[PDB]
Amino acid sequence: DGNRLMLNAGRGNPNFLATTPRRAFFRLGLFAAAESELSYSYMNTVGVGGLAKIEGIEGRFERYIAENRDQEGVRFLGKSLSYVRDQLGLDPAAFLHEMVDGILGCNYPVPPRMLNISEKIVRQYIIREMGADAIPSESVNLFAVEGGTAAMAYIFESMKVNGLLKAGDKVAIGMPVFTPYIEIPELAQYALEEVAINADPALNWQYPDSELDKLKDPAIKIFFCVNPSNPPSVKMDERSLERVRKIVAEHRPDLMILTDDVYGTFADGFQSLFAICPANTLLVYSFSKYFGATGWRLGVVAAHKENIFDLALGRLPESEKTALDDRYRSLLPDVRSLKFLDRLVADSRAVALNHTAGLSTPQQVQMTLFSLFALMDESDQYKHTLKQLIRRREATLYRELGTPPQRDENAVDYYTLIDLQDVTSKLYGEAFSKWAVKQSSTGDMLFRIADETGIVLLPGRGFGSDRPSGRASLANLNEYEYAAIGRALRQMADELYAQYTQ
């Protein structure tokens, strides 16, 4: 399943996971279960509870924390309350009841877009990790969704439905990008045309100015990028972000930006395009990778309250405004005041079902607890732990290839590129590396590792020339498995060197 996921979906699945916010969730659940039972009125039954009451919830919660000081999840829950009440200044009783009611999953999400306090908490996390601090928190709204996967499906459908993207429109795509994102515009369902914004291996996988300038073409309605990138696993540098900023400000104030920033926390000092061009950007952030929460399906779509999506909607042709008046008629009297972010919500479940739309309340609670976990960790201990783990696995991989590729300030390294030439160069000089590349390819490299270790790697391209290389995730295997990849690739190189000399 780990090997099959990389081939099919270009992921990625970590073998680590955040335990403390998970324990806090299950412990909160036991508290909420007791809260439900406090509202059950009848004798001689079993298995039926009532709704949790907001009245006196703080005092009951405080007792629960005091009696269970020995439980890690409970201590976390205790500090979470302080963080929300004391640092965020939010209503403590309202926070607790939203969490209790939320984890019970006994009420339809209200509002459907996101639960009130969860939105306020999660956006603090999002703003911080995206480097978007210069934007007032109150100007950022979130739509809680079933991972980045759901976000992308919802966004393209709403773009189509609301006439923001039309058949024949050009979508610029920062490349190399993983397979799934190439196909969605290529669907006849959308019939969009791709323009490649190509990263340069000579610039260490940054986008050249010349490539970024392609965005000046007014036929290009949207810039779509994974940042930090996947496969290449680098973050857009200061120059690149500035270039986009100037292009938007100077030439294309109408350019929509769709940015997928799931790997952000794995970079040093990450800054999102959302931070740089908030009015022009829809941010997709997934909790999957950082918290080891792929199965939880936790994501948000973020939008600035003043954005070009709502501006474009006000500039639509009359026939389209009339069609949308009909579409959203049941939702509100004035459809023209219905914002794009809330249209995403309505479009996600056929409009008529808007009031039972949204991410499940226990999922939002869990998302909120992951968010708190990271926010309360001021010295970034969890982040550093994961980074040290990733570096250890890297050292182990390149042990006999030695050693790892040199990493700059823009490095992410969730993924690593094992380049045959660079490896054979490090081992046996420049002359040998030129020859070794002409002998074997990516196929012979990936098939050998697979046969020796049972691990299949991603080809390392490209698009390029088929420079013989493979990509491994530093997130999904254990040390001896990275050591076995290195050993198999070292024997392959050693046998090439014995076929070099003689």
Inter-helix orientation angle 92-104/72-82, to 10° = 140
106 class by beta-carbon count within 10 Å (0-12 exposed, 13-18 middle, 19+ buried):
middle
Q: Is 128 labeled as ligand-binding?
A: no
Q: Of the two residues 299 and 460, which places its CB atom closer to ligand PLP in the complex? A: 299
Task: Rule CB under 8 A: say whether 429 interacts with its own copies.
Answer: no
Residues shown for the chain: 502
Q: Of the two residues 33 and 93, which places its CB atom closer to its own copies in the complex? A: 33
Task: Rule CB under 6 A: say whether 360 interacts with ligand PLP.
Answer: no
Could you say which DSSP state residue 473 is in?
E
Report the partner that residue 314 touches, choosing among its own copies, ligand PLP, Cl ion, none (CB closer than 5 to 8 A by kind).
Answer: none
Report the partner that residue 129 touches, choosing among Cl ion, its own copies, ligand PLP, none (CB closer than 5 to 8 A by kind).
Answer: none
Minimum distance of Cl ion from residue 117's CB (angstroms): 23
Task: Rule CB under 8 A: say whether 353 interacts with its own copies.
Answer: yes
Secondary structure, 3-state, 58-79: HHHHHHHHHHCCCCHHHHHHHH
Report the partner that residue 276 touches, choosing among ligand PLP, Cl ion, its own copies, none (CB closer than 5 to 8 A by kind).
Answer: none
Task: Rule CB under 8 A: say whether 45 interacts with its own copies.
Answer: yes
Alpha-carbon gap, residue 270 to 229, rounded angstroms: 12
Q: Is 286 labeled as ligand-binding?
A: yes
Task: Rule CB under 6 A: say whether 113 interacts with ligand PLP.
Answer: no
Residues in 121-180 at the binding interface with its own copies, rule: CB under 8 A: 133-134, 136-137, 146-147, 149-150, 152-153, 156, 161, 179-180
Task: Rule CB under 8 A: say whether 330 interacts with its own copies.
Answer: yes
Half-sphere exposure of 226 (CA within 13 A, CB side): 25
Task: Rule CB under 8 A: say whether 36 interacts with its own copies.
Answer: yes
Q: One symbol per residue from 225 to 264: x for binding ligand PLP (CB under 6 A), - otherwise; what is it?
A: -x---x-----------------------------x-x--
Listed in order, strand segments (DSSP E) in 110-247 are 140-145, 170-175, 193-198, 220-226
Task: Rule CB under 8 A: say whether 182 interacts with its own copies.
Answer: yes
How many Å separate Cα 372 from the centre of its chain?
17
Q: Which run of H or E residues covers position 264?
A: none
Contact between 125 and 375 (Cβ < 8 Å) = yes
Task: Rule CB under 8 A: say whether 14 interacts with its own copies.
Answer: yes
With a CB cutoff of 8 Å and minimum separation 6, the contacts of 319 are none
Q: Is 297 labeled as ligand-binding?
A: yes
DSSP class per residue in 89-111: ---HHHHHHHHHHHHHT-S--SS
Which residues partner with 217 through β-bridges?
Answer: none
Residues in 357-376 at the binding interface with its own copies, rule: CB under 8 A: 357, 359-363, 366, 373
Task: Rule CB under 8 A: say whether 430 interacts with its own copies.
Answer: no
Give which of 145, 140, 174 is closest to 158, Cα–Cα.
145
With a CB cutoff of 8 Å and minimum separation 6, the contacts of 490 are 400, 401
Report the partner that residue 289 touches, choosing among Cl ion, its own copies, ligand PLP, none (CB closer than 5 to 8 A by kind).
Answer: ligand PLP
Contact between 285 and 130 (Cβ < 8 Å) = yes
Q: Where are the alpha helices (DSSP H) in 349-380?
A: 361-376
DSSP class per residue in 400-444: TS-SPPP--TTB--SEEEEEHHHHHHHHHHHHHHHHHHHH--HHH
Which one of residues 149, 204, 421, 441 is an interface residue with ligand PLP (CB under 6 A)? 149
Q: Is 108 labeled as ligand-binding?
A: yes
Q: One symbol per residue from 95 to 124: x for binding its own copies (CB under 8 A), - otherwise; what is it?
A: ------xx-xxxxxxx--------------
Residues in 43-82 at the binding interface with Cl ion, rule: CB under 5 A: 71-73
Minimum distance of ligand PLP from residue 295's CB (angstroms): 9
Report the partner that residue 326 touches, choosing among ligand PLP, Cl ion, its own copies, none (CB closer than 5 to 8 A by kind).
Answer: its own copies
Task: Rule CB under 6 A: say whether 147 interacts with ligand PLP.
Answer: yes
**By three-state DSSP, how is residue 230 classified?**
coil
Task: Rule CB under 6 A: say whether 11 interacts with ligand PLP.
Answer: yes
Q: Of the two residues 10 and 278, which places its CB atom closer to ligand PLP in the complex? A: 10
Contact between 260 and 301 (Cβ < 8 Å) = no
Minimum distance of ligand PLP from residue 12's CB (angstroms): 4
Annotated binding site for pyridoxal 5'-phosphate: 11, 108, 148-149, 230, 286, 288, 297
Which residues are near Cl ion by CB under 5 A?
23, 71-73
Which residues are near ligand PLP by CB under 6 A?
10-12, 147-149, 178, 226, 230, 260, 262, 286, 288-289, 294, 299, 356
